[PDB]
């Protein structure tokens, strides 16, 4: 019959990142996690207890509970036509800090820094982000850059 076990279809998902086997480095145990932090889930194959389900590998959630050797995260899971909130208990070996939030903070600090200097000197801070605008007109010089004329290559087999 069919097989739908807890760790089904996890042959390569829980591998040990070839030539990174053995014990885990000590920097993952000295990182602090507070309530409200944003973390992403990436399970470790060498730690069996507190291992997340295969569905949550790669997901990103918010920490809501700080236990002794584990943390509680909040994951929004799409079931049917709605999203369901999930509360998960994972040890610190299966999670890490999410860098997507990191660059947001100094943008807040830079936006406050750009706005603070402009209150003394001038209105129109222009603190918003903009997409890649189309390039403007310039002048192409051919001094020492005479255009070389190209032609398509004739068919050659060279087998």
């Amino acid at each position: 019959g069919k097989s739908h076990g807890y760790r089904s279809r996890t042959r390569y998902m829980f591998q040990r990142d070839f030539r990174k086997h053995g014990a885990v480095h000590l920097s993952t145990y000295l990182k602090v996690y507070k309530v409200g932090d944003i973390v992403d889930i990436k399970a470790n194959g060498s730690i069996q207890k507190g291992m997340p389900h295969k569905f949550y590998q790669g997901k990103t959630g918010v920490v809501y509970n700080v236990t002794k050797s584990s943390v509680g995260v909040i994951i929004n899971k799409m079931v049917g036509n709605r999203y369901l909130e999930k509360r998960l208990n994972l040890r610190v070996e299966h999670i890490k800090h999410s860098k997507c939030r990191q660059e947001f903070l100094e943008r807040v600090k830079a936006n406050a820094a750009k706005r603070a200097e402009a209150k003394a000197q001038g209105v129109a801070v222009q603190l918003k982000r903009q997409p890649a605008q189309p390039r403007e007109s310039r002048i192409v010089s051919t001094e020492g850059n005479v255009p070389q004329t190209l032609a398509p290559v004739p068919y050659e087999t060279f087998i």
Partner: protein, 51 residues
């Protein structure tokens, strides 16, 4: 009660954009440009006429 199209009804063309009255004075669409007499450089000639 009825949409009258400009560019072929001159009374509507003067209700909107009142600059259109003096646009026909100098005619502003058959303007003669100043005739400059500079020529392109030599290096552009053999590049265009290259084989």
């Amino acid at each position: 009660v009825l949409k009258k199209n400009p560019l072929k009804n001159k009374q509507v063309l003067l209700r909107l954009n009142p600059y259109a009255k003096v646009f026909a004075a100098e005619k502003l669409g058959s303007k003669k440009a100043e005739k400059t007499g500079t020529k392109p450089a030599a290096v552009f000639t053999e590049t265009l006429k290259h084989d």
